[PDB]
Amino acid sequence: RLVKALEDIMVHYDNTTRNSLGNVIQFIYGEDGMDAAHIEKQSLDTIGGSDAAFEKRYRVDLLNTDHTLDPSLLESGSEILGDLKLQVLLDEEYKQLVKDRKFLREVFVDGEANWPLPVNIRRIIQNAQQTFHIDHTKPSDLTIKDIVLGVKDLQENLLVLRGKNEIIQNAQRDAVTLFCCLLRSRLATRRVLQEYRLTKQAFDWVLSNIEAQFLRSVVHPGEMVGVLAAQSIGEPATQMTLKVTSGVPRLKEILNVAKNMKTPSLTVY
Amino acid sequence: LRMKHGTYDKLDDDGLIAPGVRVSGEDVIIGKTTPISSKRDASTPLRSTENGIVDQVLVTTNQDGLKFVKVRVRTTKIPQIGDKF
Amino acid sequence: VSTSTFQTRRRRLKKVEEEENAATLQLGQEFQLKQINHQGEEEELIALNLSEARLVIKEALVERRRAFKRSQKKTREKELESIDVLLEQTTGGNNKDLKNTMQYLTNFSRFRDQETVGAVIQLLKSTGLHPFEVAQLGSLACDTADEAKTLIPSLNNKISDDELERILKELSNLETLY
Amino acid sequence: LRFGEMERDCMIAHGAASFLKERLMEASDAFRVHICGICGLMTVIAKLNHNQFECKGCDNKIDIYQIHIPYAAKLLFQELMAMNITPRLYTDRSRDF
Amino acid sequence: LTCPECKVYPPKIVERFSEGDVVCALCGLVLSDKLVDTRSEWRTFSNDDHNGDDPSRVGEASNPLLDGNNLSTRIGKGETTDMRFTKELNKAQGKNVMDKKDNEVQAAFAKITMLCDAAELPKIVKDCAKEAYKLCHDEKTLKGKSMESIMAASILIGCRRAEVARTFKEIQSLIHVKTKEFGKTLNIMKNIL
Amino acid sequence: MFFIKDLSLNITLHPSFFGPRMKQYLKTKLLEEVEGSCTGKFGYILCVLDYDNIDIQRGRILPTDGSAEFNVKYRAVVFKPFKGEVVDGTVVSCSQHGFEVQVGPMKVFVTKHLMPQDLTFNAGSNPPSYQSSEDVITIKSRIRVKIEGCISQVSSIHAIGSIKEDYLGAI
Amino acid sequence: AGRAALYKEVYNVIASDGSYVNYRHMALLVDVMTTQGGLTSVTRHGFNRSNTGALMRCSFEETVEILFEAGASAELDDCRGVSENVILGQMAPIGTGAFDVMIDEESLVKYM
Amino acid sequence: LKEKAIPKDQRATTPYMTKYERARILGTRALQISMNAPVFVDLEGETDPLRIAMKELAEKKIPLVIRRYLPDGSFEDWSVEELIVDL
Amino acid sequence: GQQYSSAPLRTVKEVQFGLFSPEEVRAISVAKIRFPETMDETQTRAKIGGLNDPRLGSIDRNLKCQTCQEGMNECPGHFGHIDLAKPVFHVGFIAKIKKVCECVCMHCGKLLLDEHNELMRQALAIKDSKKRFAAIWTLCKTKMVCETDVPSEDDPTQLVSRGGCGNTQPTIRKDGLKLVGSWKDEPELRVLSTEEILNIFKHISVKDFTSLGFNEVFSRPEWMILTCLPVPPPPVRPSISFNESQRGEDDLTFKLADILKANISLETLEHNGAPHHAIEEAESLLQFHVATYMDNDIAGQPQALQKSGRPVKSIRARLKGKEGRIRGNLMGKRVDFSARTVISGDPNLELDQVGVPKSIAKTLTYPEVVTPYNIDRLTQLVRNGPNEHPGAKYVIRDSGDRIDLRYSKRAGDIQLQYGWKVERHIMDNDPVLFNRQPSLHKMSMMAHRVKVIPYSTFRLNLSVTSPYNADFDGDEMNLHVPQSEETRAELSQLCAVPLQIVSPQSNKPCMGIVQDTLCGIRKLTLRDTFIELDQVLNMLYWVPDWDGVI
Ligand SMILES: [Mg+2]
Ligand SMILES: [Mg+2]
Ligand SMILES: [Zn+2]
Ligand SMILES: [Zn+2]
Ligand SMILES: [Zn+2]
Ligand SMILES: [Zn+2]
């Protein structure tokens, strides 16, 4: 019944999900426009911990002697102190990071940080280190401008939807929302320079891979999506080995949309 | 008409193989024709997937008296790969 | 593999609809005057008078000989002999239909030159009669408004008897003296 | 051996459109019928040798098409007609989408 | 069939059933691609199915030699059935029973069937007695012979062929036999090829 | 009459032909199939115009066999006769039943009945002809006919004509 | 909010067995069940009573009855559904069949 | 209607080749090569029509265009030469 | 093969469903169908000009199929017709016929409700024809009068006269396969005759029936009542002439002989002195046999039974279930170029590989096309013959003429030509489709690399057991051999085992290290586990990828 129901549902050339009638089921596949085989559980960070710890990890105050990036971190570090023009780039950087923090706490109310997303940023950074032989004792060639704007630019290039119209562009922006939260959290100025210790050559490569991998992750028009969803729910229901009605006999109730249901309850908070 | 691609040679004039002859797939065990006119071939071949030696052959008649023949084919099955225990 | 047209039609399952072809200018569903270009634009029906048809086929076949010699890189009685040469170079040789068509046009054309053919095309186009009528007017040689209106019933009140008489006087003068 | 409904589901779920077609036609059924283009029936009297067609009833000897469909489909269609249902097949569209 | 490629008088052609082809043994050319299992095809007409569950069992066998061309279907009580309609429809079939003098002479078969079961005779004997009778009953050679003794004579004609031994005195007692009459009727039929 | 018609034919090419001389083979195949044909729908497809500007288009590759199908759009000169059309032509045959008139690619049969009163079949003539006091119609003469009716036979179009009415016949 | 409750409920059946199915699959099912405006059942009188192809609907549960009504309703199957092209023994518009392949003369002549 | 043909500039699909396109392309070309079609690459002693098609694909010497049909009936034609192979 | 046709090859784009016009049923027909006798032109061996082939379809390895000739493997079958003595309701539409009668005025033919009624004007507005008919019905099933005088859409002070006839409407009810009315001290109750219903239906306006969901061209209400019966050609209802005293006829052939017998009887009854009640009796019997042939499993009605007690396999019955023409013959089907045997695990095989017993490989085939690449190798296979493993079974010429390599005397000699196909044995590295049933998810069917091996089992790597749900406790699996260069790409490109490692089902790998390997991998890894040189060298060399560096 699941197969025969979701039979005709497929991804179309406009990243949409329709049936044999052209009726829109989903506007962008799986809300995000991604192929599930290219997804991985990844830590969101920004979401958790004390406000105090977050300010430590992300805040960069080139105008404050103790909260500036120590010149052990970058060549630029000595001449970076009290740079008014640059601090505006960082103030904007951190602003966006706190905006992301309040937001994610609104999306995942309980505060769960481990969500499946495409592109394993952790492993990309691991590989950049393993490859370029990153010296964890020498100051990076990266500029605040090199980092700040590079991450800004990479965001623009992570397209799921191409389309000159506003509706499509908004649709595009909305689908990348969550992933960009991950990207921003991971590629923060302090984090890149302090935690990762990346070079300009290393960082540029890190961005380059993020782009190609992201694009590679996006769904393919033609994906039989519906039959997939049906088989993906169907198969594990077979694996189900049997005071609320649960498992196979309850799945039955749901699919039939049975009005006279076995264990009716209401959780009063 | 419509003869089997198999070998009729193992049959003696009685349309039967003598017990003792070693058989093989598609080989004819019972030679039979349903005359309609000259005649069709309603012969009985050994199951293709099989082989062996003819064990016993019995000729008889039933309650009403129809000539019928029964053929026993003996094989020795030796344990092999896909075999279940 | 049956050769298709430039227009769409609703398969109402009821084949039964097809009406006859006449001198009520009730030509086929194909041959109706408001027709469509391969470029999709609505253009008017192209019916040719012989002479016009003869120059068309002739020109067409000459362009073809060129094309064939290009790919090879890597008096009236005299015309009858000449066309038979061109056909044995440009056509399948099996084109008995076209070989007769050409013998016919070479023998039945009133206007030889392209200049003359245009002068007919000009003089006849003020009339604004169906493209079928102008072709018949260029092919059938008439001396009276009646001859014309009889052989071409389609006309009848489309043109004046006297106005049509002027057209005929001009076409007889334009007629080539072979 | 049965290439059934569920096996079909998997070939679709993969995206192998041609392997499905192969298994359903070439590797099994695979039949050729001539259909009239006026009514969508397989009532053409195709005389292949003489290159003569004709669906009388539409009195059509011109508007004929040859289709490659499974024999069991030809059966279903003939069974639908036996029961007064007309499963008219067309080689042209008339709807958009 | 015969091979176009070669053509030697006796056409040595093989049926490669498992590979599903009719092939010319001499040249190798396959003459036919479509081949049917006859035995399995016959099993859609005659089968284990009495229940009517089998999607394979789609037909029914008949005996042209005896039944002729009479294809008929019982109107009977099914799972859901109001007995009213079964009666109505069968009542209707009764009025439509206006069968010929010979379409009513199939009741002479019903006699032989009742006479064989009483004589403890096999199915094959009936199908032979019903055969010989169906061929001689209309005969001029037989004419006005004792109709009761003509069908009893066909029972011995059936028993002689099916090798089922029965004495004239046995069949004589089974129905009623005027010895000279049922000996004369058994000879005109025996003469009828 | 004698029209120029915008027509399109579907030609199916085998992959061994997917070489540089592709277009050449297709424009050739169009001329093989189309040129010199006869359909009731269009009449005599006589001459394919603009051999250089013949449009091959793209070829949809079929999914079972590797072959590709193209809808070749071309312009041609067609000949379709109509009931009521007055036509000039030549006598090509002459029996006791009437005569045939060749008009371009097609013949028109004038039955001995749609003929003037006194013009009658004379067999003593050489070749036999139709002999009036003021007309002789035989095996080589020019005639003006009126198409009375057409008979569509998908390979050829036959017609029946008249010379009875005014302004028709000998020319 | 119904769609949300329905996702939650299905998700919870999968999570009771300690299994996990990626969000999107259960989303798609739930999205289907609701896009109608109400809760459409994955049953013969639910999903199968939509206005899809007749040959599509007949392949599941109501076969003949769907086909009689399709006949009397003078229904038209545009053959977009996978089911229809399978019955017809044609290349389905799915995956490899979701597009069309053509040859270009221009580029052929360019390459060789 | 053939108005449904979306112009070159104004195309909106992925500039990348779908797993399905590439699979059909390789399958199509490999079929054509086995059908005895001319090959558009120097086969460096190659024999397998798939391995051959993959060489054609990798050298971007395949004269085939993918007509991507859109849910409304519209379509976008993309040459294998232009499409990006990243899979 | 199957002979060439000049007709243009096209693909079915649309399926126009509909009902048969009795005029169309007659128009198609190639034969009259006058006799309830099959063949036997009385004790003969041929088809009578009355039931199967009275000008009909072809069977019996004989061309004779009316000019068409063709015979069995080319002829689709041609439809005949049976002309019914009186009209009968089509079983399927008795329901709708009742619902149409309840909508329309009996004897008048007009729709009971108008554009004048407020709630009807709403119903008539419905876009879905199916949803529209439901709405129209609910409102006018309660309308028990064909109105003539109706109040205007201005004020009810002046009544605008609509369509005529001011008759009472019957309270229509189903009683068997008959429709019974009741017109309102005690009502008038009688049976509505198929004849009336039909004439009343013909009288329904185009606009009226069009609102009821019907269509002026393909499906009119009048066509819901049968008059002319399409007689299916034998390929639909097969016959088998066994041994001259044994003949097998299809249930449908029996049922048609009943329709005809019934029809012939009623014809005689109507022709002769019509005794009314004797005719309506004969009618309901014809109504049954006709009904019962399309659907035998009718509620309330008795069943058509074949002597054996077996109920007749109706047309409905055949299409019906899972095993029915749709589910069992179209959505699914057994196929050629398929194999099944027991499965066993091989720790020595590769993940993507499948072990194939030589016997299977020697039976299963690939039709490789002759090109100047494979030309020499294919000749060698043809030369090797079908008996030896690396070889070929059949050679297919340009013509379509196929040659059985086990019968050609000049086997090795065959001068092969480009374009000729050589059906060769399945070889090592050929891509095959592997499948364990129940095929529950896309990973239950994956493409594998052949490894022709000894012994009667399909050998597979264990890490592949997980998605197939296989155990070597006597389980069997299926193989499917692609026959095209295109289909093998679909296999190698989208279905191949390596492409299935990380699954979209739960964004994680669907295959891992299992059983022995899993058990031993822990044991090998403990801090106590120490290997000495002798065994280190052997282990290192066991890794096929090893860099040769100790
Ligand atoms: Mg298992
Ligand atoms: Mg297990
Ligand atoms: Zn037709
Ligand atoms: Zn031979
Ligand atoms: Zn036939
Ligand atoms: Zn009324």
Listing DSSP states for B49-66 in one string gives T-EEEEEEEEEEE-TT--
Show the CA angle centred on residue D9, arms to residues D5 and D14, nearest 5°: 150
Q: Tell me which of F39, F42, F64 to substitute to probe the interface with D (most D C-beta atoms closer than 10 Å).
A: F64
Cα I465 to ligand 2 centroid, rounded to whole Å: 8
Burial of E148 (C-beta count, 10 Å sphere; 0-12/13-18/19+): middle
Q: Tell me which of C1, C2, C3 to substitute to probe the interface with F (most F C-beta atoms closer than 10 Å).
A: C3
Q: Tell me which of F23, F57, F61 to substitute to probe the interface with H (most H C-beta atoms closer than 10 Å).
A: F61
Number of compact structural domains in chain C:
2
Structure tokens at C98: 């076209």
C98 and C60 in a common domain: yes
DSSP labels for E11-51? --EEEEGGGTEEEETTT-BEEES----HHHHHTTTS-S-SS
Neighbours of chain A (3+ CB pairs under 8 A): D, G, H, I
Residue E144: CB atoms within 10 A of its CB come to 5
Neighbours of chain H (3+ CB pairs under 8 A): A, D, F, G, I
CB E76 within 8 A of CB I302: yes
Classified as helix, coil or strand, A97 is: helix
The residue count for chain G: 112
Burial of F170 (C-beta count, 10 Å sphere; 0-12/13-18/19+): middle
B84 vs I contacts (CB less than 8 Å): 473-474
Solved by what technique? Answer: X-ray
From the list I178, I176, I293, I190, the residue with the least C-alpha distance to E82 is I176
Query: Which ligand is closest to the CA of E30, given by its number?
Result: 4
Cα E122 to ligand 6 centroid, rounded to whole Å: 69
Interface touch I485/H22, C-beta < 8 Å = no
Dist. CA B16–CA B67, nearest whole Å: 13
C81 and C29 in a common domain: no
Q: Is D87 on the interface with I (CB under 8 A)?
A: yes
Dist. CA F68–CA F100, nearest whole Å: 45
Q: First and final CA of chain A: distance in angstroms? A: 36
Evaluated on CA atoms I260, I262, I264, I270, the torsion sign reads negative
Dist. CA D52–CA C2, nearest whole Å: 14
Report the b/e string of I86-103 with b at 16+ CB within 10 A: bbbbbbbbbbbbbbbbbb
Interface touch D90/I230, C-beta < 8 Å = no
From the list D30, A229, D15, the residue with the least C-alpha distance to H21 is D15
Interface touch D10/A224, C-beta < 8 Å = no
Q: Is E124 on the interface with B (CB under 8 A)?
A: yes
Number of compact structural domains in chain H:
1
Window 71-90 of I: residues touching D by CB (8 A cutoff) are 74, 76-79, 90
Tell me which residue range forms the domain holding C67: 48-72+75-178
CB F110 within 8 A of CB F61: no
Q: Do chains F and C touch (3 or more CB pairs under 8 A)?
A: yes
Our CA-based measurement puts residue F5 at a distance from the nearest CA of chain H, in whole angstroms, of 20
Interface touch H32/F58, C-beta < 8 Å = no
Dist. CA D1–CA C166, nearest whole Å: 86
CB I494 within 8 A of CB G95: yes
Dist. CA F99–CA F115, nearest whole Å: 10
Backbone angle region of E154, left / alpha / beta, with phi > 0 → left and psi within -120 to 50 → alpha: alpha
Distances (CA, A) of G18 to C143, D73, G13, I161, I215: 102, 44, 9, 72, 55
Evaluated on CA atoms A125, A127, A130, A134, the torsion sign reads negative
Report the b/e string of C72-88 with b at 16+ CB within 10 A: eeeeeeebeeebeebbe
Window 23-52 of E: residues touching I by CB (8 A cutoff) are 23-30, 33-34, 41-42, 44-46, 49-52
Cα torsion G47, G50, G56, G58 to 10°: value is 80
Topology adopted by domain E1-193: Cyclin A; domain 1 (1.10.472)
D76 vs G contacts (CB less than 8 Å): 87
Classified as helix, coil or strand, I458 is: strand
Q: Is D59 on the interface with C (CB under 8 A)?
A: yes
Q: The domain spanning residue H53 has which CATH number? A: 3.90.940.10
- Spell out the long-range contacts of C110-116 with Cβ–Cβ below 8 A and sequence spacing 24 or more: C110/C50, C110/C51, C110/C138, C110/C139, C110/C141, C110/C171, C110/C174, C110/C175, C110/C176, C111/C51, C111/C52, C111/C138, C111/C174, C111/C175, C111/C176, C112/C51, C112/C176, C112/C178, C113/C176, C114/C55, C116/C51, C116/C174, C116/C176
Q: Is H48 on the interface with G (CB under 8 A)?
A: no
Cα C126 to ligand 5 centroid, rounded to whole Å: 59
Interface touch I8/F10, C-beta < 8 Å = yes
Q: Which residues of I are annotated as a binding site for Zn(2+)?
A: 65, 68, 75, 78, 105, 108, 146, 165
Dist. CA I407–CA A232, nearest whole Å: 51
Q: Is I342 on the interface with B (CB under 8 A)?
A: yes
Radius of gyration of the CA atoms of chain E, in A:
25
From the list F54, F46, F65, F53, the residue with the least C-alpha distance to F29 is F54
Cα I423 to ligand 4 centroid, rounded to whole Å: 20
Query: Which ligand is closest to the CA of I113, given by its number?
Result: 6
CB A124 within 8 A of CB A203: no
CB I404 within 8 A of CB E30: yes
From the list I415, I421, I236, the residue with the least C-alpha distance to I315 is I236
What are the sequence ranges of the domains in chain E?
1-193
Radius of gyration of the CA atoms of chain B, in A:
15
**Which residues of chain D approach chain G closer than 8 Å at the C-beta?**
8, 12, 14-18, 20-21, 24-25, 29-30, 68-70, 73, 76, 80, 83-86, 93, 95, 97
C140 and C53 in a common domain: yes
Q: The domain spanning residue C88 has which CATH number? A: 1.20.1250.40
Cα D53 to ligand 5 centroid, rounded to whole Å: 12
Structure tokens at B11: 């049959």
The residue count for chain C: 178
CB C102 within 8 A of CB C129: no
DSSP labels for B20-47? TBEEETT-EEE--EEE---EEE--EEPP
Interface touch C15/D62, C-beta < 8 Å = no
Distances (CA, A) of I69 to I32, I62, I66, I77, I81: 19, 9, 6, 11, 20
Report the b/e string of I419-443 with b at 16+ CB within 10 A: bbbbbbbbbeebbbbbbbbebbbbb
G94 vs D contacts (CB less than 8 Å): 12, 15, 17
Measured between CA atoms, the residue of chain G closest to residue A236 is: G19
Dist. CA E118–CA H1, nearest whole Å: 83
Amino acid (1-letter code) at residue B63: Q
Helix residue ranges per DSSP H, chain E: 38-42, 64-67, 83-95, 107-118, 123-136, 147-161, 168-174, 181-191
Dist. CA F118–CA F134, nearest whole Å: 9
Q: Is the bond preceding I311 in cis, omega lying within 30 degrees of 0?
A: no
* D36 annotated binding-site participant: yes
Q: Is G19 on the interface with A (CB under 8 A)?
A: yes
Cα I121 to ligand 6 centroid, rounded to whole Å: 19
Show the CA angle centred on residue F66, arms to residues F61 and F70, nearest 5°: 35
Measured between CA atoms, the residue of chain F closest to residue C71 is: F24
Could you say which of F20, F58, F64 has the minimum Cβ distance to residue G103?
F58
**DSSP β-bridge partners for residue I19:** D85
CB H13 within 8 A of CB A219: no
Our CA-based measurement puts residue D13 at a distance from the nearest CA of chain F, in whole angstroms, of 19
Cα torsion I222, I228, I232, I237 to 10°: value is 100
Q: Tokens 């185009």: give the residue.
A: I206
Dist. CA E137–CA A93, nearest whole Å: 114
C132 and C98 in a common domain: yes
DSSP labels for G6-60? HHHHHHHHHHHTT----HHHHHHHHHHHHTTSS---SSTTTGGGSSS-HHHHIII
Q: Is A7 on the interface with I (CB under 8 A)?
A: no
DSSP class of residue C132 equals H
Cα I438 to ligand 1 centroid, rounded to whole Å: 10
Structure tokens at F121: 């079949």
Q: Is D95 on the interface with H (CB under 8 A)?
A: no
Structure tokens at C151: 């052989």
Q: Which residues lie closer than 8 Å to I358 by C-beta, 6 or more apart?
A: I389, I452, I453, I454
* D10 annotated binding-site participant: no
Give residues after which chain B gaps, C-N over 2.5 angstroms.
37
Q: Which domains does chain D have, with CATH numbers?
A: 1-85 (3.90.1800.10)
Dist. CA C115–CA H61, nearest whole Å: 51
CB G26 within 8 A of CB G8: no
Interface touch I218/C13, C-beta < 8 Å = yes
The residue count for chain D: 97
Our CA-based measurement puts residue I55 at a distance from the nearest CA of chain E, in whole angstroms, of 19
Measured between CA atoms, the residue of chain D closest to residue I492 is: D16
Structure tokens at I32: 């009259």
Interface touch I245/E60, C-beta < 8 Å = no
Structure tokens at E187: 């000879």
Q: Which residues lie closer than 8 Å to A11 by C-beta, 6 or more apart?
A: A17, A29, A219, A220, A221, A222, A223, A225
Measured between CA atoms, the residue of chain B closest to residue I241 is: B36
Could you say which of I441, I504, I507 has the minimum Cβ distance to residue A235?
I441
Q: Do chains G and C touch (3 or more CB pairs under 8 A)?
A: no
I441 vs D contacts (CB less than 8 Å): 10, 13
Tell me which residue range forms the domain holding H76: 1-87
